[PDB]
Amino acid sequence: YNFDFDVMHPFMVRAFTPFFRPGNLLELGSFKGDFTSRLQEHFNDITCVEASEEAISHAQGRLKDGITYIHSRFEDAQLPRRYDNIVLTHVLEHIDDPVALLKRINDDWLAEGGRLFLVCPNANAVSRQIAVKMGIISHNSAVTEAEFAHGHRCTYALDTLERDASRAGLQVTYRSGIFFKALANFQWDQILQTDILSKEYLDGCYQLGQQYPDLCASIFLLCEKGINQ
């Protein structure tokens, strides 16, 4: 029915699974708990940070126990411990000072041996590149008016995402992509109401995407803590 929640969310969890560390999980920007519900299958100790009281309240009404909720902007958040897994998915592109957020993650929140799961929408996704060729988007890394209205301040590609992670002091351990994406979201949502594409086709786009990270819907950096003093 819905591309981001019914297709992308499940494949994002699948992409993270082989890298998850045992222990606890911090979900930054957990919004209404839609992704949290999927992570609860893997983690019994999840902390969620979200600035919207309303989103957080919605989450709290639909998730199982074992979640610690923190209603705060990231700059103001005082967390009680450090975390073995941290999830920052489709959040960084909303942040005015992304390097500062990533640096907090590296310096304050990641446990020793902990891993950051950094995922952003990808400037070089096939569907976007086609939109650029059609002249609907000026260029790949452009921020469209709709994206700006949604809160985006940039459109990452693997090059600029790893730059920001490196500038923050993180160690980028793995680079990958999630879901080979040749149609726009609005076309997916139409086509998914039909029997034209199978579940197996969607799995094939996930499998093939790993071979063409630069062309995927979302790009994925697995990062570990770097030493900063």
Interface residues with Cl ion (CB under 5 A)?
82, 111-112, 148, 154, 160
Work out what residue 96 binds among a copy of itself, Na ion, Cl ion, none; the CB cut-off runs from 5 to 8 Å by kind. Na ion
Distance CA 191, CA 57 (A): 33
Taking the complex as a whole, the smallest distance from the CB of residue 59 to a copy of itself amounts, in Å, to 29
Q: What's the burial of 18, exposed, middle or buried (CB within 10 Å: 0-12/13-18/19+)?
A: exposed
Taking the complex as a whole, the smallest distance from the CB of residue 120 to a copy of itself amounts, in Å, to 14
Q: In the complex with a copy of itself, which residue's Cβ is closer, 78 or 194?
A: 194
Taking the complex as a whole, the smallest distance from the CB of residue 146 to a copy of itself amounts, in Å, to 18
Q: In the complex with a copy of itself, which residue's Cβ is closer, 32 or 181?
A: 181
Number of residues that bind Na ion (CB under 5 A): 2
- The closest residue (CB) to Na ion is 96
Taking the complex as a whole, the smallest distance from the CB of residue 28 to a copy of itself amounts, in Å, to 21
Q: For residue 96, which amino acid is it?
A: D
Q: In the complex with Cl ion, which residue's Cβ is closer, 15 or 161?
A: 161
Taking the complex as a whole, the smallest distance from the CB of residue 152 to Na ion amounts, in Å, to 9
Q: In the complex with a copy of itself, which residue's Cβ is closer, 68 or 174?
A: 174
- 């790993």: which residue's tokens? 210
Contacts 24+ apart (CB under 8 A), 149-156: 151/94, 152/93, 152/94, 153/93, 153/94, 153/95, 153/96, 154/93, 154/98, 155/93, 155/121, 155/123, 156/92, 156/93, 156/120, 156/121, 156/122, 156/123, 156/219
Taking the complex as a whole, the smallest distance from the CB of residue 78 to a copy of itself amounts, in Å, to 30
Contact residues: a copy of itself, CB under 8 A? 17-19, 115, 126, 129-135, 138-141, 157-160, 162-163, 166, 172-176, 180, 182-183, 187, 190-191, 194, 196-197, 200-201, 203-205, 207-208, 210-214, 222
Binding mask 70-99 for Na ion (x = CB under 5 A): ------------------------x-x---
Binding site for Na ion (CB under 5 A): 94, 96
